[PDB]
């Protein structure tokens, strides 16, 4: 049995996929116990596991939901004529729309500048809820964490660099360090706080 | 916003009544102006006939009729009319489309005529943004021959969905100024069910629209004299042509704009998605999408996933036994729960009472021991696992009163404590 | 990876336990830098605080040292062949030998019988460095500080009791009182001198 054909992958949301396709093997219709019931399989497009997650449908297009953001996705196709099904069809694929990230860049470390004082050099690693091309790493450092989160000092990092120069900073003062990730649809939460203190005056010498 | 009363509820909200052929391009496959031919225009103020005739280039502001003329400011006292050259009659036909962007609720869509009205025209439209037609109305004396369809068929339920032909509105009486106006819902059984009509519903959608000017009207037999001054009087002219509806939404959208892409798109509400609203928005797969109706909203509501998942799915066997309310499976459920909305904590997890289920850390791990209790999956109340004979602790990581832990791993602590 | 299993705690003196066990984890031995190590934890039995006290080992048996003479130890026992280790082992107890006290009784008070003369009730607490059950109170008492620390009145308590009567004496009369504890394992050290000042006749009236 010939298994459909022009199978097509449309994102939709960053979650949902419309897969298309059309059966060339129309008989007298419509008629009875035997309409053909199509299954519309997918899977994370070239990965390690993926196990399929298939669904039935006797319409001509079926659509997937609940797929991870920014995610490419392995759409194929059988029919089943009782008691005669199909071959998979042609995979078809789709990537998912972007979204917010949904966490805050890890292994956030604060290294002090060498051998200038005054100045450090924050490193991070991008976030693995990323769902996106993060665009943008808005970062935060102050001398007191009773402010509010908003007025501390905010600085805008390129979004594809993961260390960031900070300057005159005031020596033997405690400061603090909140960094967040921003896409193409947003921006995700905050990290946690990472407190660093500078150096005193006598302790550079030598 | 008129999507949701003062409490506020949400509510079915559409887009405003518009022309939604107002300033858009037409495109069309006849125009005078090149070359610049003669048209002659007949009249009548008192008996018989009368002819007075002019010129019509396309490269002079004046005497030009392109087909801007159609969908423009239409001044009843100085009528921008467009035009045709010249003697396109059988089976040559000249149509007029227009390219909506964006399926329409087309309510009636009319037009006005310089020159008098065809014998016979045909309107067609679009639902998949003009790769395929089919028929929206037909205009004939004889519609039997000319678009083989029944003369004003009846409609009833089956037949509601099949364009209909009718001779009305065809005979050239009003040579000047006359008028073809289409109701879509006009003499069709469900119309005053409307909002619970699918087919209905769909029969007013159109992405495009074309009307196709067939055969060309004639005063008793005197055309067929083909002169310079007789053939250059008939032809087909419009002085406006309108297109009533508002964008498709399914009442869940209060206008469309064009986004990014330039494309128009309903601006969804009620946790929509799609170009017309047509979906639900991710992770509010909790009842089916739905229309939206004058009576319920149908909103789409968001999967309960007690803060502990991102993306779901509907499942209608689940939605058929929570008797219809709830059918949104939570999908890949963290922070160490289990369940189809991550109600309560996986096997080899107690719940820490202290924390409300939609807490982070809502799940404690168990640790059974791996050699002193018998299983991993403890009380979920207290959490103690399941301890084995001679095995005590909460994760049973020592031994009873009397025992002592022995070198089997499958016989922990059973050795009794002997007297020396 | 399975953890050592067998775990025994033995009380040697009144701050050393030895603590054995086995590992059946045995393969082709002996090499090379993965050596099966082991870490032996440990902490007051069933307390309030506790922050356990580990220390690394390649044998089959750790001797914990300077524990507190008469306290429960919880002890349990992990193995690390790098670079993978294994859960903690199933505990172990063991309680120190007793010692004699290092300290002596406190709250030595000295109150005058009710409406008899002549005689006390001398009361008190435990010492808070017992080591050991308290098997016995010594006390002493007399009337001159300037004799010697042994040949006072030495009476001996019960051990179990706080309370001793003192009677027949003399009125108008200074009164020394020292106290120590005993134990299984010997006698602690006695308190300071605290004096008491027997009533006049004439003031017992009324
Ligand atoms: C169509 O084109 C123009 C209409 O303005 C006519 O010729 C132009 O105007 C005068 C004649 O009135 C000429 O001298 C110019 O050279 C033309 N200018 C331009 C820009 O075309 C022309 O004759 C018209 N065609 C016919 C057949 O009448
Ligand atoms: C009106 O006439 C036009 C002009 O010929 C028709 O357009 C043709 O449609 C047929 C139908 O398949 C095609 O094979 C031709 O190639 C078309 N012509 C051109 C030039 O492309 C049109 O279909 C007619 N309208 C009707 C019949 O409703
Ligand atoms: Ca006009
Ligand atoms: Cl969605």
């Given at each position: 049995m010939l298994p459909p054909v022009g199978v097509q992958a449309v994102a939709l949301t960053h979650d949902a996929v419309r897969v298309s396709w059309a059966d060339n093997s129309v008989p007298k219709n419509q008629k009875t116990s035997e309409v053909r019931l199509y299954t519309v399989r997918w899977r994370t497009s070239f990965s390690a596991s993926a196990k399929y997650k298939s669904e039935d449908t006797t319409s001509l297009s079926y659509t997937a939901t609940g797929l991870k953001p920014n995610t490419m996705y392995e759409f194929s196709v059988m029919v089943t004529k009782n008691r005669r099904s199909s071959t998979w069809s042609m995979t078809a694929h789709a990537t998912t729309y972007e979204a917010a990230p949904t966490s805050a860049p890890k292994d956030l470390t604060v290294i002090t500048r060498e051998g200038k004082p005054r100045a450090v050099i924050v490193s991070w690693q991008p976030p693995l809820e990323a769902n996106g091309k993060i665009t943008a790493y808005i970062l935060f450092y102050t001398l007191d964490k009773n402010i509010p989160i908003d007025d501390w000092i905010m600085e805008t990092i390129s979004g594809d660099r993961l260390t960031h120069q900070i300057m005159d900073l005031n020596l033997d003062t405690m400061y603090y360090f909140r960094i967040q990730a921003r896409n193409s649809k947003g921006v995700g939460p905050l990290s946690d706080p990472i407190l660093f203190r500078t150096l005193k005056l006598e302790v550079l010498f030598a | 916003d008129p999507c949701s009363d003062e409490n506020g509820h949400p509510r079915r909200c559409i887009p405003d009544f518009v022309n939604a052929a107002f300033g858009k391009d037409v495109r069309v496959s006849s125009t005078c102006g090149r070359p610049p031919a003669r048209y002659c225009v007949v009249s009548e103020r008192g008996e018989e006939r009368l002819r007075s005739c002019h010129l019509c280039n396309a490269?002079?502001?004046?005497?030009a009729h392109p087909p801007a003329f159609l969908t423009d400011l239409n001044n009843p006292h100085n009528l921008t009319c467009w035009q045709s050259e010249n003697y396109l009659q059988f089976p040559h036909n000249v149509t007029l489309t227009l390219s909506l962007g964006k399926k329409f609720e087309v309510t009636y869509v009319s037009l006005q005529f310089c020159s008098p009205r065809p014998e016979s025209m045909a309107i067609y439209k679009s639902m998949d943004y003009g790769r395929t037609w089919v028929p929206f109305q037909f205009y004939s004396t004889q519609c039997r021959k000319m678009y083989n369809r029944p003369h004003r068929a009846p409609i009833t339920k089956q037949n509601e969905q099949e364009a209909v032909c009718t001779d009305s509105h065809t005979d050239m009486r009003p040579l000047s100024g006359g008028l073809i106006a289409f109701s879509t819902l006009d003499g069709r059984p469900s119309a005053h069910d409307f909002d619970n009509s699918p087919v209905l519903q769909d029969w007013v959608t159109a992405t495009d629209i074309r009307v196709a000017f067939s055969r060309l009207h004639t005063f008793g037999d005197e055309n067929e004299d083909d002169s310079e001054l007789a053939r250059d009087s008939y032809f087909y002219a419009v002085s406006d042509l309108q297109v009533g509806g508002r964008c498709k939404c399914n009442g869940h959208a209060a206008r469309c704009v064009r986004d990014r892409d330039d494309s128009l798109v309903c601006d969804c509400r009620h946790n929509t998605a799609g170009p017309e609203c047509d979906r639900c928005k991710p992770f509010h797969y909790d009842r089916p999408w739905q229309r939206a109706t004058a009576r319920e909203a149908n909103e789409c509501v968001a999967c309960n996933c007690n803060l502990h998942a991102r993306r779901c799915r509907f499942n209608m066997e689940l939605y058929k036994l929570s008797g219809r309310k709830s059918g949104g499976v939570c999908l890949n459920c963290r922070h160490n729960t289990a369940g189809r909305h991550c109600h309560y904590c996986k096997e080899g997890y107690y719940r820490d009472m202290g924390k409300p289920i939609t807490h982070r850390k809502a799940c404690k791990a168990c640790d059974c021991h791996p050699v002193g209790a018998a299983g991993k999956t403890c009380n979920q109340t207290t959490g103690q696992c399941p301890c084995k004979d001679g095995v005590t602790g909460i994760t049973c990581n020592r031994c009873a009163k009397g025992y002592q832990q022995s070198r089997s791993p499958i016989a922990p602590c059973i050795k009794e404590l002997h007297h020396h």
């Open positions: - | 490269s002079d502001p004046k005497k």
